[PDB]
């Protein structure tokens, strides 16, 4: 997908298998904002989406919160409090060919900047000076979308980098896209580290009565506690204690 | 538990129209769809047709539209149907059976959203048997 | 430098800006479009790159000539020169705190009585900005029963020529009690 | 339009050990399956309702399984009554279409 | 009757005691107000940062807690050594002082 | 295809207060018997909403600017309201979201659409069969370029036109947040006539639709039974605000009430203590009353362009050891002109964000000007070491500026 | 230490990096102390063919 209007994928009831990703691509820039790298694996992800854009090398800092451009303002705006990694690579050889590769159009000039995972389309004059376009190219009136000029003779800065922009909730609602760890048993009544859902800590946990909605997945009686969590692999409802009561 | 009587065996000249009545006992007649199954002698069983009664809105199979009539009567409690310019394939049997999924009497259809529908027919009546031939 | 040589062997033009925020007058600003000025009324201000909430008057303190910016207490700016009109103003908080709300139980009224400590009674409707604030505040910011305390202005409570046992107090000598048509009693 | 092919279309088994039948979907389904029981000369009976559940009143021994464009119902203890026809219904667009059917004998 | 002495003891207990909890649901500016969920998606030289954040703004709270509590309970001990004065010549003997 | 409608009647629309609706859940976490105060768009208590109703011939279906958040209600009888529809221009040059509920499905789709004035879904109904069956469906003229498409569960509803009082109360409540549109519903049964009821609403979560469009327009469909009829219908229209609230939830994980924090003193000592329940005595409130609605600017009064053509294309551009200082004065600094015809590879800035770089006005500026090569542009931060930020050009530790380097192998380096 | 890696896996050699050049081969402390020096060897270390 190109820049101006890039691509949103939902991906659902499936795993994440990182060790395959690097396999046989090489990622440039594996930033991760929020989430580190180390402890992606043993998390399970709940809303997950893939954003898609071709951006030239110069550019690849843009796509980042708090950073500003004509790439970060008029065509892809990230949020302040963004929680989700971003993978970029090079693509000189599949995205550029001889000639210049026109496909690829970015949004050169824009009214005003871009609310934060907003998508503009509109294709509509923009007048420079005071004088109206009246829908008609003229003096001081220019198309919006301007064309990459892609080559595989160029330098770094001026050659594709396919960027791809996770975004993820962690910890919240249900979850359907999990990392590649494997399942154990589960030893209840005793006290034992647990990794339910990608929930990490060390407690006791016994069985609670309270019913969930159907749109919940945990609960927190009281927040900084984390009491309430469902087995995912028996859909039981317990409860998460500390390891020993505090009366001694 | 609830009873389920479908009209009698009718015989007829396939050229002209039949009425098929049912009358479901014991449950909420508004409430769930009452669908329709025909079944060939020696064949599996196909869906023909879903009825909305409180809505007395209905739809019908692709391949039977627009050639099957399929009303209701609230007042006397029974699901009418009716067929028009029947063939030798038509001869077999017919069930009418309620469906799994329960609704209200509002367009709750704005929750599609949120819960998943799962129709399952579950009741099923004893059936009749329309035979016709020339 | 040659042409034929990687990233590391090629020139890269370095310019390097070294700034200075808020402190001396300004002669260099963003492309920031300038709008007319709202004073005496609570609105967000963009005076000179100063960005904040909070209401403004009319001040008559004389600045130096390489002055520009002011607080008589760090972290709060007093007062800022307007950059168009050179007018010398300042810069205060939205309202002024001194709001108290006295109250029985919940069970025993819902009806409330509103505290406003060190100011005029004239002045009720300017201090707490109640033209652009709730109907339901209000009414609770002009009244009928209208009682003028040291600490200031009380709205909403009668008072009365009686004198009666204190239990909750008020600031300056007055005090609120529920008592007899029923309502709440200074 | 949909189709679902049960396999295979002719069984053969005894009394009182397990079965396994299956059938295969042409596109996505996800998880709407109904497991249709039809004794001969009687009125059809559901059985399983959303591939992974059982009915009420039905006992334990029947249970269903399978995703995507696969499903399978395997059978437990089998009864003498158990001899019956089986269809397998998808319910992911109209029209809703039935299945084969599978016949088992003694 | 007259017994809102008494029962603002335990009432102001009982507001020390909620409004800590509520305290404690706070993050204090880290990224989540829970330790869980920031010591599974963080590297231990990020997640010290945080860790350390949680902490001291927990501790904080239990200061503050703790402050109110204990000169709470230092004038709870002035009304006590009150009491007792009043245990001292009113029950074992009799008071010539006036009110 | 689309046309006017006929035998308009023109009447003015009535406001009323909505008793403590357009609330929801701010969160999908689970909670019991706690009270937890939010900030978000919400619906003031007691705000004026427009009483949109039909019968005569009373017809309407305004177009109204969106104001970010936009509550909705409905009193239905027989299945007249069916979707909405959100954008900014409505005539297929920006994006357009619609949502319809028509005769077996409901469809969302994001797409560029042309809308008429008067769009509307027919039901039409015959003398010799009792059946109601829809028939007219126009709301948008052309298909464009589709950018969003969703198709829900095929099902069917009540299209028999009931008589008497209204049977039915949804509710909804639509927000465009951080590129997310939230929609959150739940309907009551109620038994009134003309009426919006008194009693709590708990809008339960339904879609989070990730579309990130610009958003300032709505307008309502609406279902009609040239002559025609409008039956019986009434509709409800709000705008949300930001405001602060405390919602209590009961035992069953639903939410009991909600405490206003700006409409009452009351209210804003349950805020200020995060009880609904107060004692007597004098409570000091925090400041939750006044939130402002407008934005001021002021800035010298100069319009003049700041000599950055001189800088960026200086020809002749100085070297390291005796790098140059340019002073800039008495103009303006217009960011956007630079990007349109130079690449700028490391754009780092220390003490001043980029995203606030446009709002502030800058005092004692000055330019410098270096050639290095792409090994050493790590070198010009404060704080790194090298043959550059030791011996040739060292910046301060409290450095307050902007770096900015691009490349030049084109223009600074020949052949030999 | 002393390894030769491509130019894309540099940023693996740092504390809280992942990959197949800091998972398999050569993984940094989180407490680490030190300096990484790292320079471009494309005339030395490579060679055609
Ligand atoms: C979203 O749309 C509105 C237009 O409805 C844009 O706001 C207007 O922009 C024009 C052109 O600059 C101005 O003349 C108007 O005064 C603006 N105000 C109105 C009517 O909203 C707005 O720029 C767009 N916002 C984003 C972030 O895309
Ligand atoms: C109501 O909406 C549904 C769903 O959008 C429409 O059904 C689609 O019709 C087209 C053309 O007939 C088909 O290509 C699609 O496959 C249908 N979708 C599904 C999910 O079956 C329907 O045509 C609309 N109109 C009426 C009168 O029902
Ligand atoms: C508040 O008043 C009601 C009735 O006036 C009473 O039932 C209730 O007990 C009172 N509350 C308390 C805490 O006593
Ligand atoms: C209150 O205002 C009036 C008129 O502005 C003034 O005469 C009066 O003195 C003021 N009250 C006090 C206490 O200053
Ligand atoms: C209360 O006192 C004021 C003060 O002058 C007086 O004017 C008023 O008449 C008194 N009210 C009554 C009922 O005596
Ligand atoms: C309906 O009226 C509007 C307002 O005059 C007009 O712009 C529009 O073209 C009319 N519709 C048709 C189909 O002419
Ligand atoms: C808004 O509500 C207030 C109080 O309910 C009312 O006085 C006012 O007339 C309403 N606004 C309009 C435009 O009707
Ligand atoms: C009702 O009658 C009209 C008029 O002939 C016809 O078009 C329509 O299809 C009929 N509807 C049904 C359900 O028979
Ligand atoms: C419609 O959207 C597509 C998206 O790829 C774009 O290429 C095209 O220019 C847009 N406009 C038209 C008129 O097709
Ligand atoms: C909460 O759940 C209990 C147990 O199911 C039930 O008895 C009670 O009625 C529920 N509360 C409400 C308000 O429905
Ligand atoms: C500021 O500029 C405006 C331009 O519209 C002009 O009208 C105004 O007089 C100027 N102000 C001063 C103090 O020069
Ligand atoms: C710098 O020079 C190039 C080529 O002469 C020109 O196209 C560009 O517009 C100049 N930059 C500015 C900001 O004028």
Same mark, same amino acid.
């Given at each position: @997908?190109?820049?101006?209007?890039?691509?949103?994928?939902?991906?659902?009831?499936?795993?994440?298998?990182?060790?395959?990703?690097?396999?046989?691509?090489?990622?440039?820039?594996?930033?991760?904002?929020?989430?580190?790298?180390?402890?992606?694996?043993?998390?399970?992800?709940?809303?997950?989406?893939?954003?898609?854009?071709?951006?030239?090398?110069?550019?690849?800092?843009?796509?980042?919160?708090?950073?500003?451009?004509?790439?970060?303002?008029?065509?892809?705006?990230?949020?302040?409090?963004?929680?989700?990694?971003?993978?970029?690579?090079?693509?000189?050889?599949?995205?550029?060919?001889?000639?210049?590769?026109?496909?690829?159009?970015?949004?050169?000039?824009?009214?005003?900047?871009?609310?934060?995972?907003?998508?503009?389309?509109?294709?509509?004059?923009?007048?420079?000076?005071?004088?109206?376009?009246?829908?008609?190219?003229?003096?001081?009136?220019?198309?919006?979308?301007?064309?990459?000029?892609?080559?595989?003779?160029?330098?770094?800065?001026?050659?594709?980098?396919?960027?791809?922009?996770?975004?993820?909730?962690?910890?919240?609602?249900? @979850?359907?896209?999990?990392?590649?760890?494997?399942?154990?048993?589960?030893?209840?009544?005793?006290?034992?580290?647990?990794?339910?859902?990608?929930?990490?800590?060390?407690?006791?946990?016994?069985?609670?009565?309270?019913? +969930?909605?159907?749109?919940?997945?945990?609960?927190?009686?009281?927040?900084?506690?984390?009491?309430?969590?469902?087995?995912?692999?028996?859909?039981?409802?317990?409860?998460? #204690?500390?390891?020993?009561?505090?009366?001694? | 538990?609830?009873?389920?009587?479908?009209?009698?065996?009718?015989?007829?000249?396939?050229?002209?129209?039949?009425?098929?009545?049912?009358?479901?006992?014991?449950?909420?007649?508004?409430?769930?769809?009452?669908?329709?199954?025909?079944?060939?002698?020696?064949?599996?069983?196909?869906?023909?047709?879903?009825?909305?009664?409180?809505?007395?809105?209905?739809?019908?199979?692709?391949?039977?539209?627009?050639?099957?009539?399929?009303?209701?009567?609230?007042?006397?409690?029974?699901?009418?149907?009716?067929?028009?310019?029947?063939?030798?394939?038509?001869?077999?049997?017919?069930?009418?059976?309620?469906?799994?999924?329960?609704?209200?009497?509002?367009?709750?259809?704005?929750?599609?959203?949120?819960?998943?529908?799962?129709?399952?027919?579950?009741?099923?009546?004893?059936?009749?048997?329309?035979?016709?031939?020339? | 430098?040659?042409?034929?040589?990687?990233?590391?062997?090629?020139?890269?033009?370095?310019?390097?800006?070294?700034?200075?925020?808020?402190?001396?007058?300004?002669?260099?600003?963003?492309?920031?479009?300038?709008?007319?000025?709202?004073?005496?009324?609570?609105?967000?201000?963009?005076?000179?790159?100063?960005?904040?909430?909070?209401?403004?008057?009319?001040?008559?303190?004389?600045?130096?000539?390489?002055?520009?910016?002011?607080?008589?207490?760090?972290?709060?700016?007093?007062?800022?020169?307007?950059?168009?009109?050179?007018?010398?103003?300042?810069?205060?908080?939205?309202?002024?705190?001194?709001?108290?709300?006295?109250?029985?139980?919940?069970?025993?009224?819902?009806?409330?009585?509103?505290?406003?400590?060190?100011?005029?009674?004239?002045?009720?409707?300017?201090?707490?900005?109640?033209?652009?604030?709730?109907?339901?505040?209000?009414?609770?910011?002009?009244?009928?029963?209208?009682?003028?305390?040291?600490?200031?202005?009380?709205?909403?409570?009668?008072?009365?020529?009686?004198?009666?046992?204190?239990?909750?107090?008020?600031?300056?000598?007055?005090?609120?009690?529920?008592?007899?048509?029923?309502?709440?009693?200074? | 339009?949909?189709? &679902?092919?049960?396999?295979?279309?002719?069984?053969?088994?005894?009394?009182?050990?397990?079965?396994?039948?299956?059938?295969?979907?042409?596109?996505?389904?996800?998880?709407?399956?109904?497991?249709?029981?039809?004794?001969?000369?009687?009125?059809?009976?559901?059985?399983?309702?959303?591939?992974?559940?059982?009915?009420?009143?039905?006992?334990?021994?029947?249970?269903?399984?399978?995703?995507?464009?696969?499903?399978?119902? #395997?059978?437990?203890?089998?009864?003498?009554?158990?001899?019956?026809?089986?269809?397998?219904?998808?319910?992911?667009?109209?029209?809703?279409?039935?299945?084969?059917?599978?016949?088992?004998?003694? | 009757?007259?017994?809102?002495?008494?029962?603002?003891?335990?009432?102001?207990? @009982?507001?020390?005691?909620?409004?800590?909890?509520?305290?404690?649901?706070?993050?204090?500016?880290?990224?989540?107000?829970?330790?869980?969920?920031? &010591?599974?998606?963080?590297?231990?030289?990020?997640?010290?940062?945080?860790?350390?954040?949680?902490?001291?703004?927990?501790?904080?709270?239990?200061?503050?807690?703790?402050?109110?509590?204990?000169?709470?309970?230092?004038?709870?001990?002035?009304?006590?050594?009150?009491?007792?004065?009043?245990?001292?010549?009113?029950?074992?003997?009799?008071?010539?002082?006036?009110? | 295809?689309?046309?006017?409608?006929?035998?308009?009647?023109?009447?003015?629309?009535?406001?009323?207060?909505?008793?403590?609706?357009?609330?929801?859940?701010?969160?999908?976490?689970?909670?019991?018997?706690?009270?937890?105060?939010?900030?978000?768009?919400?619906?003031?208590?007691?705000?004026?909403?427009?009483?949109?109703?039909?019968?005569?011939?009373?017809?309407?279906?305004?177009?109204?600017?969106?104001?970010?958040?936009?509550?909705?209600?409905?009193?239905?009888?027989?299945?007249?309201?069916?979707?909405?529809?959100?954008?900014?221009?409505?005539?297929?040059?920006?994006?357009?979201?619609?949502?319809?509920?028509?005769?077996?499905?409901?469809?969302?789709?994001?797409?560029?659409?042309?809308?008429?004035?008067?769009?509307?879904?027919?039901?039409?109904?015959?003398?010799?069969?009792?059946?109601?069956?829809?028939?007219?469906?126009?709301?948008?003229?052309?298909?464009?370029?589709?950018?969003?498409?969703?198709?829900?569960?095929?099902?069917?509803?009540?299209?028999?036109?009931?008589?008497?009082?209204?049977?039915?109360?949804?509710?909804?409540?639509?927000?465009?947040?951080?590129?997310?549109?939230?929609?959150?519903?739940?309907?009551?049964?109620?038994?009134?006539?003309?009426?919006?009821?008194?009693?709590?609403?708990?809008?339960?979560?339904?879609?989070?639709?990730?579309?990130?469009?610009?958003?300032?327009?709505?307008?309502?469909?609406?279902?009609?039974?040239?002559?025609?009829?409008?039956?019986? @219908?009434?509709?409800?229209?709000?705008?949300?605000?930001?405001?602060?609230?405390?919602?209590?939830?009961?035992?069953?994980?639903?939410?009991?009430?909600?405490?206003?924090?700006?409409?009452?003193?009351?209210?804003?000592?349950?805020?200020?203590?995060?009880? +609904?329940?107060?004692?007597?005595?004098?409570?000091?409130?925090?400041?939750?009353?006044?939130?402002?609605?407008?934005?001021?600017?002021?800035?010298?009064?100069?319009?003049?362009?700041?000599?950055?053509?001189?800088?960026?294309?200086?020809?002749?551009?100085?070297?390291?050891?005796?790098?140059?200082?340019?002073?800039?004065?008495?103009?303006?600094?217009?960011?956007?002109?630079?990007?349109?015809?130079?690449?700028?590879?490391?754009?780092?800035?220390?003490?001043?964000?980029?995203?606030?770089?446009?709002?502030?006005?800058?005092?004692?500026?000055?330019?410098?000007?270096?050639?290095?090569?792409?090994?050493?542009?790590?070198?010009?931060?404060?704080?790194?070491?090298?043959?550059?930020?030791?011996?040739?050009?060292?910046?301060?530790?409290?450095?307050?500026?902007?770096?900015?380097?691009?490349?030049?192998?084109?223009?600074?380096?020949?052949?030999?």
């Amino acid at each position: @997908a190109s820049v101006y209007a890039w691509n949103r994928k939902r991906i659902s009831n499936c795993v994440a298998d990182y060790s395959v990703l690097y396999n046989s691509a090489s990622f440039s820039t594996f930033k991760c904002y929020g989430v580190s790298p180390t402890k992606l694996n043993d998390l399970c992800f709940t809303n997950v989406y893939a954003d898609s854009f071709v951006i030239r090398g110069d550019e690849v800092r843009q796509i980042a919160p708090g950073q500003t451009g004509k790439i970060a303002d008029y065509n892809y705006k990230l949020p302040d409090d963004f929680t989700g990694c971003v993978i970029a690579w090079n693509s000189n050889n599949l995205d550029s060919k001889v000639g210049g590769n026109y496909n690829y159009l970015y949004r050169l000039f824009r009214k005003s900047n871009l609310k934060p995972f907003e998508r503009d389309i509109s294709t509509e004059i923009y007048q420079a000076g005071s004088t109206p376009c009246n829908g008609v190219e003229g003096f001081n009136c220019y198309f919006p979308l301007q064309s990459y000029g892609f080559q595989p003779t160029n330098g770094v800065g001026y050659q594709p980098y396919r960027v791809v922009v996770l975004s993820f909730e962690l910890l919240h609602a249900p @979850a359907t896209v999990c990392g590649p760890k494997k399942s154990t048993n589960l030893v209840k009544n005793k006290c034992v580290n647990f990794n339910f859902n990608g929930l990490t800590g060390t407690g006791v946990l016994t069985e609670s009565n309270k019913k +969930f909605l159907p749109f919940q997945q945990f609960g927190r009686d009281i927040a900084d506690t984390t009491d309430a969590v469902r087995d995912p692999q028996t859909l039981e409802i317990l409860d998460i #204690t500390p390891c020993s009561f505090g009366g001694v | 538990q609830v009873q389920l009587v479908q009209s009698g065996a009718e015989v007829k000249k396939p050229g002209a129209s039949v009425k098929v009545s049912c009358k479901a006992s014991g449950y909420t007649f508004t409430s769930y769809y009452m669908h329709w199954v025909r079944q060939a002698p020696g064949q599996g069983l196909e869906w023909m047709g879903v009825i909305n009664p409180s809505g007395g809105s209905t739809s019908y199979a692709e391949k039977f539209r627009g050639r099957v009539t399929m009303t209701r009567d609230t007042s006397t409690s029974t699901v009418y149907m009716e067929l028009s310019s029947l063939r030798s394939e038509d001869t077999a049997v017919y069930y009418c059976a309620r469906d799994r999924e329960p609704h209200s009497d509002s367009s709750g259809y704005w929750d599609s959203l949120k819960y998943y529908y799962y129709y399952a027919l579950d009741v099923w009546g004893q059936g009749t048997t329309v035979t016709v031939s020339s | 430098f040659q042409p034929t040589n990687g990233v590391g062997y090629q020139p890269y033009r370095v310019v390097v800006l070294s700034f200075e925020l808020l402190h001396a007058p300004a002669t260099v600003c963003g492309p920031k479009k300038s709008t007319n000025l709202v004073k005496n009324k609570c609105v967000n201000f963009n005076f000179n790159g100063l960005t904040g909430t909070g209401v403004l008057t009319e001040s008559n303190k004389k600045f130096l000539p390489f002055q520009q910016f002011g607080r008589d207490i760090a972290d709060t700016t007093d007062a800022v020169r307007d950059p168009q009109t050179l007018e010398i103003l300042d810069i205060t908080p939205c309202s002024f705190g001194g709001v108290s709300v006295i109250t029985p139980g919940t069970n025993t009224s819902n009806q409330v009585a509103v505290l406003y400590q060190d100011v005029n009674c004239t002045e009720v409707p300017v201090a707490i900005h109640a033209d652009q604030l709730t109907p339901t505040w209000r009414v609770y910011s002009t009244g009928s029963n209208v009682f003028q305390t040291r600490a200031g202005c009380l709205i909403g409570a009668e008072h009365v020529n009686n004198s009666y046992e204190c239990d909750i107090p008020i600031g300056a000598g007055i005090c609120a009690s529920y008592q007899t048509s029923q309502s709440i009693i200074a | 339009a949909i189709q &679902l092919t049960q396999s295979p279309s002719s069984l053969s088994a005894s009394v009182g050990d397990r079965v396994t039948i299956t059938c295969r979907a042409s596109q996505g389904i996800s998880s709407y399956l109904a497991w249709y029981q039809q004794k001969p000369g009687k009125a059809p009976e559901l059985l399983i309702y959303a591939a992974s559940t059982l009915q009420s009143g039905v006992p334990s021994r029947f249970s269903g399984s399978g995703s995507g464009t696969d499903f399978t119902l #395997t059978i437990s203890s089998l009864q003498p009554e158990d001899f019956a026809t089986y269809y397998c219904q998808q319910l992911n667009t109209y029209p809703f279409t039935f299945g084969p059917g599978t016949k088992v004998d003694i | 009757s007259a017994l809102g002495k008494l029962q603002d003891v335990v009432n102001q207990n @009982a507001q020390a005691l909620n409004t800590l909890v509520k305290q404690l649901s706070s993050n204090f500016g880290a990224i989540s107000s829970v330790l869980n969920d920031i &010591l599974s998606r963080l590297d231990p030289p990020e997640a010290e940062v945080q860790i350390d954040r949680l902490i001291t703004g927990r501790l904080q709270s239990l200061q503050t807690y703790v402050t109110q509590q204990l000169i709470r309970a230092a004038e709870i001990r002035a009304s006590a050594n009150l009491a007792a004065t009043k245990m001292s010549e009113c029950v074992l003997g009799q008071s010539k002082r006036v009110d | 295809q689309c046309v006017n409608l006929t035998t308009r009647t023109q009447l003015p629309p009535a406001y009323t207060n909505s008793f403590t609706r357009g609330v929801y859940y701010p969160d999908k976490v689970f909670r019991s018997s706690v009270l937890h105060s939010t900030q978000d768009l919400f619906l003031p208590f007691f705000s004026n909403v427009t009483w949109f109703h039909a019968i005569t011939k009373r017809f309407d279906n305004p177009v109204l600017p969106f104001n970010d958040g936009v509550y909705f209600a409905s009193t239905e009888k027989s299945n007249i309201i069916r979707g909405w529809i959100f954008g900014t221009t409505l005539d297929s040059k920006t994006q357009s979201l619609l949502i319809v509920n028509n005769a077996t499905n409901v469809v969302i789709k994001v797409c560029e659409f042309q809308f008429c004035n008067d769009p509307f879904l027919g039901v039409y109904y015959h003398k010799n069969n009792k059946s109601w069956m829809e028939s007219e469906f126009r709301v948008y003229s052309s298909a464009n370029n589709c950018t969003f498409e969703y198709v829900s569960q095929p099902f069917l509803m009540d299209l028999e036109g009931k008589q008497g009082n209204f049977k039915n109360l949804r509710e909804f409540v639509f927000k465009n947040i951080d590129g997310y549109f939230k929609i959150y519903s739940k309907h009551t049964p109620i038994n009134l006539v003309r009426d919006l009821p008194q009693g709590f609403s708990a809008l339960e979560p339904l879609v989070d639709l990730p579309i990130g469009i610009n958003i300032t327009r709505f307008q309502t469909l609406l279902a009609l039974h040239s002559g025609w009829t409008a039956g019986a @219908a009434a509709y409800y229209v709000g705008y949300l605000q930001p405001r602060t609230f405390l919602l209590k939830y009961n035992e069953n994980g639903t939410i009991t009430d909600a405490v206003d924090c700006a409409l009452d003193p009351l209210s804003e000592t349950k805020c200020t203590l995060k009880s +609904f329940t107060v004692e007597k005595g004098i409570y000091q409130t925090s400041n939750f009353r006044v939130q402002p609605t407008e934005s001021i600017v002021r800035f010298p009064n100069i319009t003049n362009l700041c000599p950055f053509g001189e800088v960026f294309n200086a020809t002749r551009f100085a070297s390291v050891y005796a790098w140059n200082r340019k002073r800039i004065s008495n103009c303006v600094a217009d960011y956007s002109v630079l990007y349109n015809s130079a690449s700028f590879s490391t754009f780092k800035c220390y003490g001043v964000s980029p995203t606030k770089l446009n709002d502030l006005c800058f005092t004692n500026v000055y330019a410098d000007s270096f050639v290095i090569r792409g090994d050493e542009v790590r070198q010009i931060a404060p704080g790194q070491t090298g043959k550059i930020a030791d011996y040739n050009y060292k910046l301060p530790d409290d450095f307050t500026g902007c770096v900015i380097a691009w490349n030049s192998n084109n223009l600074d380096s020949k052949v030999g």
